[PDB]
Amino acid sequence: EDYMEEQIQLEEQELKQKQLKEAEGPLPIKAKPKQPFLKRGEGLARFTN
Amino acid sequence: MRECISIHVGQAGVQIGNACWELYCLEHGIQPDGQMPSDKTIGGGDDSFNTFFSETGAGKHVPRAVFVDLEPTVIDEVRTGTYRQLFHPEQLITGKEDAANNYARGHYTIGKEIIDLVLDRIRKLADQCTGLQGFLVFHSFGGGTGSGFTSLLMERLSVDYGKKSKLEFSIYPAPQVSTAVVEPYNSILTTHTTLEHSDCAFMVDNEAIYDICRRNLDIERPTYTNLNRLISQIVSSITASLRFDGALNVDLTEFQTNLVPYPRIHFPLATYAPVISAEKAYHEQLSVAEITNACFEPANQMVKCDPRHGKYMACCLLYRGDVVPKDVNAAIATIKTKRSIQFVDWCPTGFKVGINYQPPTVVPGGDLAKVQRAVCMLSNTTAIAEAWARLDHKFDLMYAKRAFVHWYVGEGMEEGEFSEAREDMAALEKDYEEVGVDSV
Amino acid sequence: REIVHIQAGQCGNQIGAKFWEVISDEHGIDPTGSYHGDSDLQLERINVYYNEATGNKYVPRAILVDLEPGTMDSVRSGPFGQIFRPDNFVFGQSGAGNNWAKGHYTEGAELVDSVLDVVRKESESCDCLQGFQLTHSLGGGTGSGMGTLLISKIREEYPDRIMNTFSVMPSPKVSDTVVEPYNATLSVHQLVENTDETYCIDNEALYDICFRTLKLTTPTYGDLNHLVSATMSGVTTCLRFPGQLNADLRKLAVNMVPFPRLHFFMPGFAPLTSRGSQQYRALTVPELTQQMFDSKNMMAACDPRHGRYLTVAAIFRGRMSMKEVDEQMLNVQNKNSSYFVEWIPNNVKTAVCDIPPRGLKMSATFIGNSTAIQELFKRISEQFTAMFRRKAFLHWYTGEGMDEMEFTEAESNMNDLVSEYQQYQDATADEQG
Amino acid sequence: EKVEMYIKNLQDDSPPVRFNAAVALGKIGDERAVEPLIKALKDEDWQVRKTAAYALGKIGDERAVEPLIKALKDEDRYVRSRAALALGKIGDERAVEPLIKALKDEDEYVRLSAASALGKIGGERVRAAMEKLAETGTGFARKVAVNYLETHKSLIS
Amino acid sequence: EKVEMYIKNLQDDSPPVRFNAAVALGKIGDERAVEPLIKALKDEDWQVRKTAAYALGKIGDERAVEPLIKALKDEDRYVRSRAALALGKIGDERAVEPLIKALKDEDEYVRLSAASALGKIGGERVRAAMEKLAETGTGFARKVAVNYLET
Ligand SMILES: Nc1nc2c(ncn2[C@@H]2O[C@H](COP(=O)(O)OP(=O)(O)OP(=O)(O)O)[C@@H](O)[C@H]2O)c(=O)[nH]1
Ligand SMILES: Nc1nc2c(ncn2[C@@H]2O[C@H](COP(=O)(O)OP(=O)(O)OP(=O)(O)O)[C@@H](O)[C@H]2O)c(=O)[nH]1
Ligand SMILES: [Mg+2]
Numbered sequence A: 001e002d003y004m005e006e007q008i009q010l011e012e013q014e015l016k017q018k019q020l021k022e023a024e025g026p027l028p029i030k031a032k033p034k035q036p037f038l039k040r041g042e043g044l045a046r047f048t049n
Numbered sequence B: 001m002r003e004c005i006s007i008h009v010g011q012a013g014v015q016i017g018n019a020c021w022e023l024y025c026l027e028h029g030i031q032p033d034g035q036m037p038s039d040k041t042i043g044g045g046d047d048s049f050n051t052f053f054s055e056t057g058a059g060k061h062v063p064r065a066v067f068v069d070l071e072p073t074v075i076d077e078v079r080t081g082t083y084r085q086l087f088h089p090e091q092l093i094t095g096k097e098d099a100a101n102n103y104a105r106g107h108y109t110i111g112k113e114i115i116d117l118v119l120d121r122i123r124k125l126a127d128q129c130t131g132l133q134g135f136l137v138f139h140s141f142g143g144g145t146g147s148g149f150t151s152l153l154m155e156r157l158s159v160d161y162g163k164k165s166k167l168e169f170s171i172y173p174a175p176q177v178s179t180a181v182v183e184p185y186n187s188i189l190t191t192h193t194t195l196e197h198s199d200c201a202f203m204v205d206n207e208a209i210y211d212i213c214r215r216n217l218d219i220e221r222p223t224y225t226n227l228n229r230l231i232s233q234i235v236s237s238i239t240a241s242l243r244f245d246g247a248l249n250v251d252l253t254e255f256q257t258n259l260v261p262y263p264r265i266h267f268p269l270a271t272y273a274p275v276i277s278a279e280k281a282y283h284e285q286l287s288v289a290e291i292t293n294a295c296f297e298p299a300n301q302m303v304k305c306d307p308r309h310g311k312y313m314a315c316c317l318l319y320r321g322d323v324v325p326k327d328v329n330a331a332i333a334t335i336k337t338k339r340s341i342q343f344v345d346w347c348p349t350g351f352k353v354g355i356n357y358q359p360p361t362v363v364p365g366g367d368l369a370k371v372q373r374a375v376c377m378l379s380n381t382t383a384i385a386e387a388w389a390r391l392d393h394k395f396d397l398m399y400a401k402r403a404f405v406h407w408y409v410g411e412g413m414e415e416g417e418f419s420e421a422r423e424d425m426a427a428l429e430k431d432y433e434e435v436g437v438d439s440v
Numbered sequence C: 001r002e003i004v005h006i007q008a009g010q011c012g013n014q015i016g017a018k019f020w021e022v023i024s025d026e027h028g029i030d031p032t033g034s035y036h037g038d039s040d041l042q043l044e045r046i047n048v049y050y051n052e053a054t055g056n057k058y059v060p061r062a063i064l065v066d067l068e069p070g071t072m073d074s075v076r077s078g079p080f081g082q083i084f085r086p087d088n089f090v091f092g093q094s095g096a097g098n099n100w101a102k103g104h105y106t107e108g109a110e111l112v113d114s115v116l117d118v119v120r121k122e123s124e125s126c127d128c129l130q131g132f133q134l135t136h137s138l139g140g141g142t143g144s145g146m147g148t149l150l151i152s153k154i155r156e157e158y159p160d161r162i163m164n165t166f167s168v169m170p171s172p173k174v175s176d177t178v179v180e181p182y183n184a185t186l187s188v189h190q191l192v193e194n195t196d197e198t199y200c201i202d203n204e205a206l207y208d209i210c211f212r213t214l215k216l217t218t219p220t221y222g223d224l225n226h227l228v229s230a231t232m233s234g235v236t237t238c239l240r241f242p243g244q245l246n247a248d249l250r251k252l253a254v255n256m257v258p259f260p261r262l263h264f265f266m267p268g269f270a271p272l273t274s275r276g277s278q279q280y281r282a283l284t285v286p287e288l289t290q291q292m293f294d295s296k297n298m299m300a301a302c303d304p305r306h307g308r309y310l311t312v313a314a315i316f317r318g319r320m321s322m323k324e325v326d327e328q329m330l331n332v333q334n335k336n337s338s339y340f341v342e343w344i345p346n347n348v349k350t351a352v353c354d355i356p357p358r359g360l361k362m363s364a365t366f367i368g369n370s371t372a373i374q375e376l377f378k379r380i381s382e383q384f385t386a387m388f389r390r391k392a393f394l395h396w397y398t399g400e401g402m403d404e405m406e407f408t409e410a411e412s413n414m415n416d417l418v419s420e421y422q423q424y425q426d427a428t429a430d431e432q433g
Numbered sequence D: 001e002k003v004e005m006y007i008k009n010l011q012d013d014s015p016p017v018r019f020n021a022a023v024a025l026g027k028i029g030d031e032r033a034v035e036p037l038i039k040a041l042k043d044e045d046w047q048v049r050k051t052a053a054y055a056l057g058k059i060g061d062e063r064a065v066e067p068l069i070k071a072l073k074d075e076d077r078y079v080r081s082r083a084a085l086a087l088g089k090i091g092d093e094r095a096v097e098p099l100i101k102a103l104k105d106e107d108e109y110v111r112l113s114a115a116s117a118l119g120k121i122g123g124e125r126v127r128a129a130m131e132k133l134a135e136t137g138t139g140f141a142r143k144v145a146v147n148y149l150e151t152h153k154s155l156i157s
Numbered sequence E: 001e002k003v004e005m006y007i008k009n010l011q012d013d014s015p016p017v018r019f020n021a022a023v024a025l026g027k028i029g030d031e032r033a034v035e036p037l038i039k040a041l042k043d044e045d046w047q048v049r050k051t052a053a054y055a056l057g058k059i060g061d062e063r064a065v066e067p068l069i070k071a072l073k074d075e076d077r078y079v080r081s082r083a084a085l086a087l088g089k090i091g092d093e094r095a096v097e098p099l100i101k102a103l104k105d106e107d108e109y110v111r112l113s114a115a116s117a118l119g120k121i122g123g124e125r126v127r128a129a130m131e132k133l134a135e136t137g138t139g140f141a142r143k144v145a146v147n148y149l150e151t
């Protein structure tokens, strides 16, 4: 997997230049919507009723 | 007359049920259009078939039967068959989706919807009865409909027909024809909840039938068609006392009087003989002495077990055909002279006998051949607990891991019902051991 | 009776299209939709996957979905592309580019309601719908991400229905996409909770069968897909033709799934063929048995010898001796008794269809719930931990509103699946208390 | 021509053989078989005695009246009741008084067969007997008499 | 020779070999076993008192009569049954009246064991109890009553 580490470091170098310009937002810094998700043990509600 | 209503539940009960009626028609001379004409009629004045067959105002004899299944496939084959004319449309009740081999689904989820409709069509048959005796329930132990819906129906029937007797014919599971892994769960669950609502249960061990098919009928790999032809031949000899003029097991109560010592131990063992392959019918026929001795060979039992590993409580021999009463008396006296046939100390040691002189009947174009004389021995041996032991071992094997238990709880049942049903089988097995434990 | 089929993404529509090509040949249905076969058995259970129309012109009950607009076009130009319902094609404006978050939360979650409406218009015309059948892959964003969103949304609208899936596993020897273990772990978390039965079709196993067994030096998707066609056609025989055992999705789930979460099946097929295999000879029942149970014939990169089977289903196809099948199937359990859990007696069920597969005179299909499937989930956990440790490409997912705690849930549930799978592998049939 | 065979069989040492013969004799229904079927009514095996009673009704010869009347006092329930049904088929009013006594029988089928036989006979002899029975008779026999008179009323009361 | 091992195993604080002791004492049969098998009919365990009845029943001693009659008014059904059947095997006529009191028992199986045992004595008081049972008894118990009366 030599192509694997070559893409990980490319993403690290590309996400450092992209975040250099994208870190100057406006007005009250409101947080970005953290999405709810499936939590472990939720699919076991069918076999309890 | 003194009528009996047959209720067939699930695929197995429906399938065995139709094969029984096919034989009943041949025995009593009824054609597949309800007609009983001069030609096919028996004569002799035997009108005892009128307990199983109602009559329209046009000599049409209609079975007092109810067929129930939570799916159409099995009952659609009835309304499209040879006997599609024999039963009234309302006697065949079908659902849209089955109980998927889950007891809880038939007893609770799906079953609760078709239960009240079934009581209605049963009441409609019970209404044409001047003196209803009770019910004959044919069903499998392993089916979702067979185990669950039957259990539900028996609970209801006790409420709606208190004074009436309930007698079952239960297909006990075989690995060679098993449809589901949960078959032991369903069998223990149905037996527990049905135990107080049933007065006499005749288990039909499918492995025992498969074994007879392989050995006696020379069938390498018998289909359900093969198994069904044999089970009807046996179940018909058990119910013939109810549909013919006789002196033994004349009515439903007599089954309990002659076979059930006390209510819980209501599982008699049927041993039918002779079972002869069609290719071997033109050999000198077996005598009354030969076929009486065959009832004591476990190879011919309808449930796999060894009666020699237990004790007897009751024994009824129901002969049919060219049986001379004096020969039966000699054969019985020979049996009585056997130290291996042991009765419990608290039960009377005897053999009740009945001979129907009408020649025995087989389905033409079938793996079974016509004999001059045959017998069915209905015995209540404490060795029938061997059959429960096999189920309880496989039940404890999975319940210790809670395997598949989720499918049941998610379908309106509680986990404690499995603990509850198994405590009943431990109580039953310990009881069977504790009564056949001694004699001198 | 009826099954609603859904195919999401490139892989979903590729395996899914080959499914309808094979089963329509076995059922006598030509590309126009009308029947042209010989046996009356072909049409007996047609209503399961088809809808009758005009003058008995059979239409597949399929819903074709993909965010890539081009996938709709490649399906229509296939052999049976003129047999699908034109309204059942729900296709987006651009694919997710192997980003699960796009499909489950943003781009895919916009298209979901449109698909649900099509699901409804097909579930409404069911006399008695039995469940759903999703064909997709966990490697990309659409089939894996949007596919698992269709699953939850369907499970909240049809809670008493069977969710059956054909889920394709990522392998680094099939696809160069570094983010595939992230999507596979995120989809497996959804599958574990919302599916009733999942057929783990491992691309690692298909690449290996083609290279090692079939000797195909340069395997293509068409050669990998041929194995999937044989498998999907085999595993579904039970519901497509009149039978006694495992004849519906629910009865199949009751016989195969002992534990709610342990519903991941390792399929298998015998014999292994590749498009154009002229030189061949009919296989005997003993050959089909030994092959069908062997790791060489497995559609999941696991060895069932490094585990135990909880349940198994064998489907034999062709005019063969029903006593010989029974003998072989008993001998397999009675010899290899050390590979089956003793606390589940009679766990292997055997069905026989008289109608054999396309071109073949005889075949066997294996469906096994083996604890050795943990060897597939350990592969995805090692590959996922490799990336999640250095925190590679997390912005790609969280940027679409996705929570980082969801990667931790997906990981902690897949490890729990492996620990549950091993607790039952080392479980003893004992009464100690 | 086969009647010759079933007549000799009627007294064969084997009870199933005499039974099968009495069954066939009723199916044939001949004058020649009347006397041997009258002898069959005194057979020690009830299954043979009951079959003779039916056979004597299907043939329906006056000669069977006196022997079938004495079968209503038989120890066997199927012989008493199956003989009453033959007396109803023959219709000879000699059966009327013996049939009224069978209405107080222990077995229900015999009681039911006797009432159905009284109804099959009819005539002024049964009518007069039922008018009296609905006064000096009690329970079931009273019920049979009141039903008889009501089902045979020529007017709407 | 080794009959004294089971002879003192009735007063054992451990119940497993205590029940096993009466199972071998009754099969061998010694004149010393008459006394300790009576003390086994006053236990807290049902398997002990019921195995004592079968051991004392095989050894047909009158010393068993007096305590075996008290075992018919037991809290268990299996003890009562083997104790009634032991009285039938020994034959003491004083056990007739208490066996008739067992025919109107809660347990339908105790009533059948008592009837079997009362039939084994076959006295003249038994003849009236069996004529009564042939009218005031369940379908199976009324059939036991008429099979004995056919003598
Ligand atoms: N002898 C015999 N046994 C049968 C037949 N059909 C099924 N069985 C047995 O019965 C058991 C399964 O029960 P089924 O009768 O098929 O099921 P059901 O009552 O319809 O219940 P569900 O289909 O689950 O709703 C297994 O032991 C079968 O092998 C048949 O026609 N004959
Ligand atoms: N066996 C098989 N795998 C396929 C096929 N096409 C794609 N794959 C696999 O599917 C995974 C990638 O997911 P895709 O289905 O191509 O992507 P998608 O579902 O369209 O989602 P997006 O790429 O995000 O639009 C990888 O594991 C591929 O090797 C096919 O026809 N057969
Ligand atoms: Mg069924």
Ligand SMILES: [Mg+2]
Binding pocket: C009, C010, C011, C068, C095, C140, C142
């Ligand atoms: Mg794509």
